[PDB]
Q: What sequence folds into this?
């Protein structure tokens, strides 16, 4: 599923991401934009053999099991494939664990490089929330 900007913002809000650990909704939407282009089926392989999955590109070395990343942990306790679904529930639940992991949203390289220190509120302007 490829989400619309406002549609994703609403789903993210319903799942309790607005101001989660102090990050307003704008940050989450911006991160999803630049990580996956709002596409739940996005996958990208990394040089270390791990793969990033779904709307927020969650990584197979620490957070999910894809059965091909040796010495991986499975901290969100899910198959990585569940992160590709049109239902973003598992992605949001796992991202909450990630963002609580001490480094906040800096775990997402696209957020740090392209959202952090910008006007993230612009990513939900216009939306009915
Ligand atoms: Cl933080
Ligand atoms: Na893993």
A:
């Amino acid at each position: 599923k490829v989400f619309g900007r406002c549609e994703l913002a609403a789903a993210m809000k319903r799942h309790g991401l607005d101001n989660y650990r102090g990050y307003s909704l704008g940050n989450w939407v911006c991160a999803a934009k630049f990580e996956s282009n709002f596409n739940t089926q996005a996958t990208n392989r990394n040089t270390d053999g791990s793969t990033d999955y779904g709307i927020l590109q969650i990584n197979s070395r620490w957070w999910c099991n894809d059965g091909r990343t040796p010495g991986s942990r499975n901290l969100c306790n899910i198959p990585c494939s569940a992160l590709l679904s049109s239902d973003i529930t598992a992605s949001v639940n796992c991202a909450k664990k990630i963002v609580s992991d001490g480094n906040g949203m800096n775990a997402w390289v696209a957020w740090r490089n392209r959202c952090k220190g910008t006007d993230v509120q612009a990513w939900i302007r216009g939306c009915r929330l």
Q: What stands out?
A: The longest strand covers residues 43-45. The chain has four helices and three strands. Residues 25-36 form the longest helix (12 residues). The chain has one domain: 5-123.
